[PDB]
Structure formats: C-alpha cells, structure tokens
Coordinates of C-alpha atoms and ligand atoms in Angstrom, one line a residue:
Chain A
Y29 CA 102.4 114.8 128.3
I30 CA 102.5 110.9 127.5
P31 CA 100.2 109.0 129.8
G32 CA 102.0 106.1 132.0
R33 CA 105.1 108.0 131.5
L34 CA 107.4 109.9 134.0
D35 CA 109.1 112.5 131.7
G36 CA 110.4 115.4 133.8
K37 CA 110.2 113.6 137.0
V38 CA 112.8 112.8 139.7
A39 CA 112.8 109.4 141.4
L40 CA 115.0 107.7 144.3
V41 CA 115.2 104.2 144.3
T42 CA 116.8 102.4 147.2
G43 CA 118.2 98.7 147.0
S44 CA 119.4 99.3 143.4
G45 CA 122.3 96.6 144.2
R46 CA 120.0 93.6 144.0
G47 CA 117.8 92.3 141.7
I48 CA 114.4 94.0 142.5
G49 CA 115.8 97.3 143.1
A50 CA 118.1 97.3 140.0
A51 CA 115.1 96.5 137.9
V52 CA 112.8 99.0 139.3
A53 CA 115.6 102.2 138.8
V54 CA 116.1 101.1 135.5
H55 CA 112.3 100.8 134.9
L56 CA 111.6 104.3 136.1
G57 CA 114.4 105.4 134.0
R58 CA 113.0 103.9 131.0
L59 CA 110.0 105.6 131.8
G60 CA 111.4 109.0 131.5
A61 CA 112.6 109.6 135.2
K62 CA 115.7 110.9 136.2
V63 CA 117.1 108.4 138.7
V64 CA 119.2 108.5 141.9
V65 CA 120.2 105.0 142.2
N66 CA 120.7 104.3 146.1
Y67 CA 122.7 101.4 147.2
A68 CA 124.1 99.7 150.1
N69 CA 127.2 98.2 149.2
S70 CA 129.0 97.8 145.5
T71 CA 129.6 101.1 144.0
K72 CA 130.5 99.0 140.9
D73 CA 127.3 97.3 140.6
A74 CA 125.2 100.7 141.3
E75 CA 127.2 102.2 138.5
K76 CA 126.1 99.6 136.1
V77 CA 122.6 100.4 136.9
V78 CA 123.3 104.0 136.4
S79 CA 125.2 103.4 133.1
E80 CA 122.0 101.3 131.9
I81 CA 119.5 104.3 132.6
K82 CA 121.7 106.6 130.7
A83 CA 122.0 104.4 128.0
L84 CA 118.3 104.6 127.7
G85 CA 118.2 108.2 127.3
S86 CA 117.9 109.3 130.9
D87 CA 119.8 110.8 133.5
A88 CA 121.0 108.7 137.0
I89 CA 123.5 109.3 139.8
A90 CA 124.5 106.7 142.3
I91 CA 124.2 107.8 145.8
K92 CA 125.3 105.1 148.4
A93 CA 123.5 105.1 152.0
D94 CA 123.3 102.7 155.1
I95 CA 119.7 102.8 155.6
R96 CA 120.0 101.5 158.9
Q97 CA 121.6 104.9 159.9
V98 CA 118.8 107.7 160.0
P99 CA 121.4 110.5 159.2
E100 CA 122.3 108.8 156.0
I101 CA 118.9 108.6 155.0
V102 CA 118.7 112.5 155.8
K103 CA 122.0 113.0 153.8
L104 CA 120.6 111.0 150.9
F105 CA 117.7 112.6 150.3
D106 CA 119.7 116.3 150.7
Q107 CA 121.9 115.2 147.9
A108 CA 119.1 113.7 145.7
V109 CA 117.4 117.2 145.9
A110 CA 120.8 119.1 145.8
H111 CA 121.9 117.2 142.2
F112 CA 118.7 117.1 140.5
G113 CA 116.9 120.1 142.1
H114 CA 113.7 118.3 143.3
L115 CA 112.3 114.8 144.1
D116 CA 109.0 113.5 143.1
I117 CA 109.0 109.7 143.6
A118 CA 110.4 107.5 146.3
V119 CA 110.8 103.8 146.3
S120 CA 112.4 101.6 148.9
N121 CA 113.5 98.2 148.2
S122 CA 115.4 98.1 151.2
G123 CA 115.3 94.8 153.2
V124 CA 117.1 91.8 154.5
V125 CA 115.6 88.1 154.8
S126 CA 115.8 85.6 158.1
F127 CA 115.2 82.5 158.8
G128 CA 115.0 80.4 162.1
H129 CA 112.4 79.0 164.7
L130 CA 111.0 81.7 167.3
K131 CA 113.0 79.7 170.2
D132 CA 116.3 80.3 168.4
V133 CA 115.9 84.0 167.7
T134 CA 118.4 86.3 169.1
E135 CA 118.4 90.0 170.2
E136 CA 121.1 90.4 167.4
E137 CA 119.2 89.0 164.8
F138 CA 115.7 90.5 165.8
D139 CA 117.5 94.2 165.5
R140 CA 119.4 93.1 162.3
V141 CA 115.9 92.5 160.5
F142 CA 114.4 95.2 162.1
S143 CA 116.7 98.0 161.7
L144 CA 116.5 97.8 157.9
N145 CA 113.1 96.4 157.1
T146 CA 110.9 98.2 159.1
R147 CA 112.9 101.1 160.9
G148 CA 114.9 101.8 157.7
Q149 CA 111.8 101.9 155.3
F150 CA 109.9 104.0 158.2
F151 CA 112.4 106.7 157.9
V152 CA 113.3 106.6 153.9
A153 CA 109.3 107.6 154.2
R154 CA 109.5 110.1 156.8
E155 CA 112.6 111.9 154.7
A156 CA 110.5 111.2 151.4
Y157 CA 107.7 113.3 152.6
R158 CA 109.9 115.9 154.1
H159 CA 111.5 116.5 150.6
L160 CA 109.2 115.3 148.0
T161 CA 107.5 117.8 145.6
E162 CA 103.5 118.0 146.0
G163 CA 101.6 115.2 144.3
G164 CA 104.4 112.9 144.6
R165 CA 104.8 109.2 145.5
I166 CA 106.2 106.9 148.0
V167 CA 106.6 103.2 147.7
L168 CA 107.9 101.0 150.2
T169 CA 108.3 97.1 150.2
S170 CA 106.4 94.1 152.4
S171 CA 105.9 90.6 151.1
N172 CA 103.6 87.9 150.3
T173 CA 104.6 86.4 154.1
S174 CA 103.4 89.6 155.9
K175 CA 99.8 88.3 155.3
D176 CA 99.3 86.0 152.3
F177 CA 101.7 83.5 153.0
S178 CA 102.5 81.6 156.2
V179 CA 106.3 80.2 156.1
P180 CA 107.1 78.1 159.4
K181 CA 110.3 79.7 160.8
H182 CA 109.7 83.1 159.2
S183 CA 108.1 85.0 162.0
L184 CA 110.8 87.7 162.4
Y185 CA 110.7 88.9 158.9
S186 CA 107.1 88.4 158.4
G187 CA 106.6 90.7 161.3
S188 CA 109.0 92.9 159.8
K189 CA 106.9 93.1 156.9
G190 CA 103.4 93.1 158.9
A191 CA 104.6 96.8 160.1
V192 CA 105.3 98.3 156.8
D193 CA 101.4 97.1 155.7
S194 CA 100.2 99.3 158.8
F195 CA 102.5 101.9 158.2
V196 CA 101.5 102.5 154.5
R197 CA 98.1 102.7 154.9
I198 CA 98.6 105.4 157.8
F199 CA 101.1 107.1 156.0
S200 CA 98.7 107.9 153.3
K201 CA 97.0 110.0 155.8
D202 CA 99.6 112.1 156.9
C203 CA 101.2 112.2 153.4
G204 CA 97.7 113.7 151.8
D205 CA 98.7 116.9 153.0
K206 CA 101.4 117.2 150.4
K207 CA 99.0 115.1 148.0
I208 CA 102.0 112.4 148.0
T209 CA 100.4 108.6 147.7
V210 CA 101.9 106.1 149.9
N211 CA 101.7 102.3 148.9
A212 CA 103.7 98.9 149.2
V213 CA 104.4 96.4 147.2
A214 CA 104.1 92.7 148.6
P215 CA 106.3 90.3 146.1
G216 CA 106.2 86.9 146.1
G217 CA 108.7 84.2 145.0
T218 CA 110.8 86.4 142.7
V219 CA 114.0 84.7 141.0
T220 CA 117.2 86.5 141.3
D221 CA 120.8 85.5 141.9
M222 CA 120.0 85.1 145.6
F223 CA 116.7 82.8 145.4
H224 CA 118.6 79.8 145.1
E225 CA 120.5 80.2 148.5
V226 CA 117.0 80.6 150.1
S227 CA 114.4 78.7 148.3
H228 CA 114.7 75.7 150.7
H229 CA 113.1 77.7 153.3
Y230 CA 109.7 78.0 151.6
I231 CA 108.7 74.6 150.9
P232 CA 108.4 71.4 153.3
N233 CA 111.6 69.4 153.4
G234 CA 113.3 72.1 150.9
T235 CA 116.8 70.8 151.1
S236 CA 115.8 67.3 149.5
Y237 CA 115.0 68.9 146.3
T238 CA 117.6 70.4 143.7
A239 CA 117.8 74.3 143.3
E240 CA 115.9 73.3 139.7
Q241 CA 113.3 71.5 141.3
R242 CA 112.5 74.1 143.8
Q243 CA 112.5 77.2 141.3
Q244 CA 109.9 75.0 139.1
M245 CA 107.8 74.3 142.2
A246 CA 108.0 78.0 142.7
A247 CA 106.6 78.6 139.2
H248 CA 103.7 76.1 139.8
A249 CA 102.5 78.1 142.9
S250 CA 101.2 80.8 140.5
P251 CA 98.4 79.7 138.4
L252 CA 100.5 80.9 135.1
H253 CA 102.8 78.4 135.9
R254 CA 105.8 80.8 135.6
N255 CA 108.3 82.4 138.2
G256 CA 108.0 85.9 139.3
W257 CA 110.7 88.3 138.0
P258 CA 112.2 91.8 139.4
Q259 CA 110.5 93.2 136.3
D260 CA 107.3 92.0 137.4
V261 CA 107.7 94.0 140.4
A262 CA 109.1 97.0 138.4
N263 CA 105.9 96.8 136.1
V264 CA 103.7 97.7 139.3
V265 CA 105.9 100.1 141.0
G266 CA 105.8 102.0 137.5
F267 CA 102.1 102.1 137.6
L268 CA 101.8 103.0 141.2
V269 CA 104.3 105.9 140.6
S270 CA 102.4 107.4 137.5
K271 CA 99.8 109.7 137.4
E272 CA 97.4 107.1 136.8
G273 CA 98.1 105.2 139.8
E274 CA 97.0 107.9 142.0
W275 CA 93.8 106.6 142.9
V276 CA 95.7 103.5 144.9
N277 CA 96.7 104.9 147.9
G278 CA 97.5 103.5 151.5
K279 CA 97.4 100.1 149.8
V280 CA 99.5 97.1 149.9
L281 CA 99.6 95.2 146.5
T282 CA 100.8 91.3 146.5
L283 CA 102.4 90.6 143.4
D284 CA 102.4 86.9 143.2
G285 CA 101.2 86.3 139.9
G286 CA 98.1 84.8 141.6
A287 CA 99.5 82.2 144.0
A288 CA 97.8 83.1 147.3
Chain B
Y25 CA 87.4 69.2 185.2
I26 CA 85.0 72.1 184.7
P27 CA 84.8 73.5 181.2
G28 CA 86.4 76.9 180.8
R29 CA 88.1 76.8 183.9
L30 CA 91.8 76.9 184.2
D31 CA 92.0 74.8 187.6
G32 CA 95.5 73.6 187.9
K33 CA 96.7 75.7 185.6
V34 CA 99.5 78.5 185.7
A35 CA 99.5 81.8 184.2
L36 CA 101.9 84.9 183.6
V37 CA 100.4 88.0 182.7
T38 CA 102.5 91.2 181.5
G39 CA 101.4 94.7 182.1
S40 CA 99.2 94.0 185.3
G41 CA 100.0 97.7 186.5
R42 CA 97.2 99.2 183.9
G43 CA 93.7 98.6 183.3
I44 CA 93.6 95.9 180.9
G45 CA 96.2 93.7 182.5
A46 CA 95.0 93.9 185.9
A47 CA 91.4 92.6 184.4
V48 CA 93.1 90.0 182.5
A49 CA 95.2 88.7 185.7
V50 CA 92.4 89.0 188.1
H51 CA 90.1 87.3 185.4
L52 CA 92.5 84.3 184.7
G53 CA 92.6 83.7 188.9
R54 CA 88.9 83.8 189.0
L55 CA 88.7 80.9 186.4
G56 CA 91.3 79.0 188.6
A57 CA 94.6 80.0 187.6
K58 CA 97.6 80.8 189.7
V59 CA 99.0 84.0 188.6
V60 CA 102.3 85.6 188.0
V61 CA 101.2 89.3 188.0
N62 CA 104.3 90.8 186.1
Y63 CA 104.6 94.6 185.7
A64 CA 106.8 97.3 184.9
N65 CA 106.4 100.0 187.5
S66 CA 104.4 100.4 190.7
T67 CA 104.9 97.4 193.1
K68 CA 101.9 98.5 195.4
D69 CA 99.4 98.2 192.5
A70 CA 100.8 95.1 191.6
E71 CA 100.3 93.9 195.2
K72 CA 96.8 95.0 194.8
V73 CA 96.1 92.7 191.9
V74 CA 97.9 89.8 193.9
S75 CA 95.8 90.6 196.9
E76 CA 92.6 90.3 194.6
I77 CA 93.5 87.3 193.0
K78 CA 94.3 85.6 196.6
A79 CA 90.8 87.1 197.6
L80 CA 88.9 85.1 194.9
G81 CA 90.5 81.9 196.4
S82 CA 93.7 81.6 193.9
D83 CA 97.4 82.1 194.4
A84 CA 99.2 85.0 192.8
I85 CA 102.7 86.4 193.0
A86 CA 103.8 90.0 191.8
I87 CA 107.2 89.6 189.7
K88 CA 108.6 92.7 188.3
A89 CA 110.4 93.3 184.7
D90 CA 111.3 95.8 182.0
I91 CA 110.0 94.0 179.0
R92 CA 112.1 96.3 177.1
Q93 CA 115.4 94.2 178.4
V94 CA 115.2 90.4 177.1
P95 CA 117.5 89.4 180.1
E96 CA 114.6 90.4 182.1
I97 CA 112.0 88.3 180.2
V98 CA 114.3 85.2 180.8
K99 CA 114.5 85.9 184.3
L100 CA 110.9 86.5 184.5
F101 CA 110.2 83.3 183.2
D102 CA 112.7 81.4 185.0
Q103 CA 111.1 82.8 188.2
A104 CA 107.8 82.2 187.4
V105 CA 108.6 78.5 186.7
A106 CA 110.5 78.4 190.0
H107 CA 107.9 79.6 192.0
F108 CA 104.8 77.5 190.7
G109 CA 106.5 74.6 189.4
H110 CA 105.4 75.2 185.6
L111 CA 103.8 77.5 183.4
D112 CA 100.8 76.9 181.2
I113 CA 99.7 80.2 179.9
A114 CA 101.5 83.5 178.9
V115 CA 99.4 87.0 178.1
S116 CA 101.4 90.0 177.2
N117 CA 99.6 93.3 177.7
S118 CA 102.7 95.1 177.2
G119 CA 102.7 98.3 175.0
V120 CA 102.8 102.1 174.8
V121 CA 100.9 104.5 172.7
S122 CA 102.4 107.2 170.7
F123 CA 100.9 109.9 168.4
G124 CA 102.6 112.2 165.6
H125 CA 102.7 113.0 161.8
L126 CA 105.3 110.8 160.1
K127 CA 106.9 114.2 159.4
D128 CA 108.0 114.7 163.3
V129 CA 108.5 111.1 164.2
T130 CA 112.1 110.8 165.8
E131 CA 114.4 107.8 166.2
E132 CA 114.2 107.9 169.7
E133 CA 110.1 108.0 169.8
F134 CA 110.3 105.0 167.0
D135 CA 112.9 103.1 169.6
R136 CA 110.5 103.8 172.4
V137 CA 107.9 102.3 170.8
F138 CA 109.1 99.4 169.0
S139 CA 111.1 98.0 171.6
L140 CA 108.3 97.5 173.9
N141 CA 105.2 96.7 172.0
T142 CA 107.0 95.0 169.0
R143 CA 110.4 93.6 170.3
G144 CA 109.2 93.5 173.8
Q145 CA 106.5 91.4 172.8
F146 CA 108.2 88.9 170.3
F147 CA 110.5 87.9 173.4
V148 CA 107.8 87.5 175.5
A149 CA 106.4 84.6 173.0
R150 CA 110.1 83.6 172.9
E151 CA 110.6 82.8 176.4
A152 CA 107.1 81.5 176.7
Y153 CA 107.5 78.9 173.9
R154 CA 111.0 77.8 175.8
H155 CA 109.1 77.5 179.1
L156 CA 105.8 76.7 178.7
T157 CA 104.1 73.0 179.1
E158 CA 103.0 70.9 176.3
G159 CA 99.6 72.2 175.2
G160 CA 99.9 75.9 176.6
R161 CA 98.9 79.2 175.3
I162 CA 100.4 82.3 174.3
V163 CA 98.4 85.6 173.7
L164 CA 99.8 88.8 172.8
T165 CA 98.3 92.4 172.0
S166 CA 97.7 93.7 169.1
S167 CA 95.5 96.8 168.3
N168 CA 92.3 97.7 165.9
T169 CA 94.5 100.3 164.6
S170 CA 96.6 97.4 163.3
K171 CA 94.2 96.7 160.5
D172 CA 90.6 97.5 161.3
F173 CA 90.6 101.5 162.2
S174 CA 93.0 104.0 160.6
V175 CA 93.7 107.0 162.7
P176 CA 95.8 110.1 161.3
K177 CA 99.0 110.7 163.3
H178 CA 99.1 107.2 164.3
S179 CA 101.7 105.2 162.1
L180 CA 104.2 104.3 164.5
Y181 CA 101.8 102.7 166.8
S182 CA 99.7 101.0 164.2
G183 CA 103.0 99.7 162.5
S184 CA 104.0 98.4 166.0
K185 CA 100.9 96.2 166.3
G186 CA 101.0 95.0 162.6
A187 CA 104.4 93.5 163.3
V188 CA 102.5 91.5 166.1
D189 CA 99.6 90.6 163.6
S190 CA 101.9 88.8 161.6
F191 CA 104.1 87.6 164.1
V192 CA 101.3 85.4 165.8
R193 CA 100.1 83.6 162.7
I194 CA 104.0 82.4 162.3
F195 CA 104.6 81.9 165.8
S196 CA 101.3 79.5 165.8
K197 CA 103.5 77.4 163.3
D198 CA 106.7 77.2 165.1
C199 CA 104.7 76.7 168.7
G200 CA 102.8 73.8 167.2
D201 CA 105.8 71.6 168.3
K202 CA 105.0 71.9 171.6
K203 CA 101.1 72.1 170.7
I204 CA 100.9 75.8 172.1
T205 CA 98.4 77.9 170.3
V206 CA 99.4 81.5 169.8
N207 CA 96.9 84.2 169.4
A208 CA 96.5 88.0 169.9
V209 CA 93.5 90.4 170.9
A210 CA 93.2 93.8 169.0
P211 CA 91.3 95.8 171.2
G212 CA 89.5 99.0 170.1
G213 CA 88.5 101.8 172.6
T214 CA 88.7 100.7 175.9
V215 CA 87.9 103.0 178.9
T216 CA 90.5 103.1 181.9
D217 CA 92.1 105.7 183.9
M218 CA 94.5 106.7 180.5
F219 CA 91.7 106.9 178.0
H220 CA 90.8 110.4 178.6
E221 CA 94.3 111.7 178.2
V222 CA 94.6 110.2 174.8
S223 CA 90.9 110.2 173.5
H224 CA 91.0 113.7 171.6
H225 CA 93.6 111.7 169.0
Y226 CA 91.2 109.2 167.8
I227 CA 88.7 111.6 166.1
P228 CA 88.6 114.6 164.0
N229 CA 88.9 118.0 165.9
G230 CA 89.3 115.7 169.3
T231 CA 90.2 118.6 171.5
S232 CA 87.3 120.5 170.7
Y233 CA 85.1 117.8 172.7
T234 CA 84.7 117.2 176.3
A235 CA 86.4 114.2 177.8
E236 CA 82.6 112.9 178.3
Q237 CA 81.5 114.0 174.8
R238 CA 84.6 111.7 173.5
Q239 CA 84.1 109.0 175.6
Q240 CA 80.3 109.0 174.8
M241 CA 81.3 109.3 171.0
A242 CA 83.5 106.3 171.9
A243 CA 80.8 104.4 173.0
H244 CA 78.5 105.3 169.8
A245 CA 81.1 103.6 167.6
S246 CA 80.1 100.4 168.6
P247 CA 76.5 99.7 167.5
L248 CA 76.0 98.0 170.9
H249 CA 76.2 102.1 172.2
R250 CA 78.7 101.2 175.1
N251 CA 82.5 101.7 175.3
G252 CA 84.7 98.9 175.6
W253 CA 86.1 97.8 179.2
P254 CA 89.2 95.8 180.4
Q255 CA 86.8 93.2 181.2
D256 CA 85.8 93.0 177.7
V257 CA 89.3 91.9 176.6
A258 CA 89.7 89.8 179.7
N259 CA 86.6 87.7 178.6
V260 CA 88.2 87.0 175.2
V261 CA 91.6 86.2 176.7
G262 CA 89.8 83.7 179.1
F263 CA 88.3 81.9 176.0
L264 CA 91.4 81.7 174.1
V265 CA 93.5 80.3 176.9
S266 CA 91.0 77.8 177.9
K267 CA 90.9 74.4 176.8
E268 CA 87.7 75.2 174.7
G269 CA 89.6 78.1 172.6
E270 CA 92.3 75.7 170.9
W271 CA 90.7 75.7 167.8
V272 CA 91.7 79.2 167.4
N273 CA 95.2 79.5 166.9
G274 CA 97.2 81.9 165.0
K275 CA 94.6 84.6 164.9
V276 CA 94.0 88.2 165.7
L277 CA 90.6 88.8 167.2
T278 CA 89.4 92.4 166.8
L279 CA 87.7 93.2 170.0
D280 CA 85.8 96.4 169.3
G281 CA 82.0 95.6 170.1
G282 CA 81.3 95.6 166.3
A283 CA 82.4 99.2 165.5
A284 CA 84.5 98.1 162.3
Ligands
LIG25 CL1 121.7 97.5 147.5
LIG26 CL1 119.0 99.3 151.5
LIG27 CL1 102.6 97.2 183.8
LIG28 CL1 105.2 96.1 180.4

C-alpha cells in the first residue's frame, strides 16, 4: 500500500466534460484509480479524458448520462459496477450556473438549476450509496456562494448549493452504515474556458472591465494572489477520497485560496 | 407611532392552517396589522384565524393558495393587494416534513418536499418582492435541521431548508432596491398537534419512548427546560417585521431556546 494513492480502487466522476470534472478524473487516475468518466454532452471530449488516464497507466471508460434523469443515474452506476466489478468512489462535478435578480427568475430557470445542481446531485449520492463498496467515498460539489460569498443576482444558484451543504452533513449519518464518508467541495473563482463568459457577474460593474482585468481581480481576491484552477479542486478531492481523508466526513470544504 | 407595532401595515402569512403560521397570523394582527390569512387546505380552520384577528380589533381575510403552483402565488398576492390596497409584510410558514434514509428516497418524495419547502418559498419571496411597498419585510421558514441540528434519515428536509438559508442572504441584496429586508426563522422543536406524530424521528430509539417522554426530552434539549411553542416563533417574526428589526437583514435566526 502506498499512502495517498488509490491503487486497486474504482472511481466514478461526473461532469468530466468541463474543466474541474476533467481535472478530477485525470487526477484520480494519476493516483491509481480506474475511472468511469461520466459526462453530459461531448463524447469526443470525454474520450480525450479517458485517453489521458490510460496514458498515465490507469484504466478508464466513458459512460454518458443525463444526471437530470434519475433512471439514467441508476443505469450509469449499474454499468460502472458491471464494467469494473465494483465501485469505491463517486465524485459529482455536475451543475450549471445561473444569474438574475429574484424579480425575474422564472419557473423554468428555477427547475433548470435545481434539477441538476440539487436534485441530480442528491440522486448521484443515492445511487453511490446503493452501489458502493464498504469504506467508500462520496464527494459532491457545493460553491463558495452557498455560504461564504454573497453575489447579488445569484440567489437561485446560491440556494441550489446551500441544499448540497446540508445534504452532505446528513448523508454522512446515513452512509456511515456502509462506512462511506460524504463530503462536499465548495470552490471559489476557478479559471476554465467558461470563466470569462461569467466573470463579470461576480464583481460590481463587472462589464466595465476587460476579461483580463476581471481575471486579475479574481486572482487578487485570494491572499496568495493567484487564480484558482481545476487542479486545486482535484488536489483536495484526491485527499478526501483517500484512506488518509477518512476523518473528514460530513463536511463542506471551501476551496478559494483564502479569499473568504 | 407606537414602537414595535404594525399599525397601518398589511401582512400576508402563508401556512396559517397549522400551529406556527396560525400563531404568526394572529400575532401580526395583535400588533396592529391587517392580515391576509393564506392557507393550503381547511377553509373553516382559516376562517377561525380570521375571526380571532377580527376579535382583536384588526381586519383579516382568508385567501387560499396551493403554494406549489406559482400561478396561484401570483394570484394570491394580486388578490391581497386588491383587497387591502397594498402589502408591506410577507411571511411564509409553508412546508412539509419528510423522513427516510437516503437509500430509500424516491423521485416523488424529493419533488413533494422541494416543490413546497424550497421552490414554493422561493416564489413566495419573488411575488412578495414584486408586490411589496418600499420598506417592507419578507420572512421565510428554514429549520434548526438546516445547519444546527443533525438528524439521521432527514437529509431531504434538511437540504430543502439549507437552500432557504442561502436564498435569504442573497434575496436581501436584490430586495434592497425596494428597501425590503429578507430573513428566515429556523425553529427547533415546536409543539403543535402534529409534533407527537413525528417526534420519535428526532431522538435515537424514539419509538421506545411514550409521546409524553418524547415531549419532555424535547423540553430538556433547551437549557430553559421547556418546549418551544408557535408563539415563540411568532414573537420573533413580529420583531423582524417591525421598524425596529430593520438592521437584521439577510439572516437566519435559529429559534430553539438555546438547544444548539
Ligand atoms: Cl460533462
Ligand atoms: Cl452532469
Ligand atoms: Cl395551511
Ligand atoms: Cl402552504
């Protein structure tokens, strides 16, 4: 046994077609896990993640699912266990962002956000509990906006992640009967190819700055004076899902480089 | 002007057909508000609340709504403003409880709980923002289970209220443009005619105790050695919706008599 490593373990990672999830999938592979690369949309993109994990010396398979549809979450987990024999780790990076003043939020937008961010993640945890081996790991995605950062016109999303924080604390109670720990990660400002399209929403008069100015401002929000990156989230997920992370259970870790 | 009083104000209170909401409606009437007694089911029950408010010297009307249906929330608020001329205060006591291990939670049960506790309350806040007079008040209902109390087999409900806590913090930002404050109350153990049917869920081996034993145990959870009552919640709501409560804004107040 090599400490911190996941040799002999099997991990499922959702949201592997965007920056953070892709980095989490590759990192769990690098640590020695075989990986089910779950994704929502681009099969070519997901297969690039599979290829990267194989190149590192670990096995991976891409399995698609619409995480809004609970029957598809059931099938995803069944197929994961059928392919690799068992499953030890489930990480959800599933979610969508949303902005708008309360006054303008529609039924459709509420449902768009909660169906994935909150309901989808709840049922990913349910199916992970049902399928996981004893002593496994579940990690869901919250946000620094749930509790630690207050963004005007971001009530819907912030609440979708506030629910996740409460879920994980109580899931840890129920999941203890299979010795499964349950935690959430709550990233701050993380730079990906989608960051620049929404970064104006997170600062007053955001549109009056250039994208580069907004990224620099985001960097200066951490006392370390750098941006957060997908690898920062992956690094913490890797610890939580290791043997050495066991005593962190039922918690939400805000990953913002000290900004809050 | 009498300090603490709501003379000349108009308040809408949802969930007026159960213990806490009924007590909040009567109390706002006692403080001088005219009250829209909104309720989900029994018209005879709601009219008893109306009658009690009238007997106290304040006007009231019962207006029914299915708070799960956003078009009905819209109509409720339109009708409130049409009847009394304006609306200053909106208090939601809308919600349902739910219990069960994560492993057994169904799609239907998830939707039953979130549609009212989280989605319904979100849109009560939206319609209150849209209809309220400048300087008004919105109060939603969270729970001590959101953050302050961890009950096994209560993940769904706990998360439905964790979302509300995040909502109110951000709603306070958006609603400030009409000088409306937004807060939540998070009651603990509150005795009503429905308490005894669920009190076993809240203590280990709950069913092995009598209802009276369970109520006494609940009482001893507060260092004051009494149960919480609907009037305790009403008292705090009355402060939050008064002029003197203005500087409490964007907050969730846990009302458990010091148990946490
Ligand atoms: Cl994806
Ligand atoms: Cl997804
Ligand atoms: Cl009611
Ligand atoms: Cl209701």
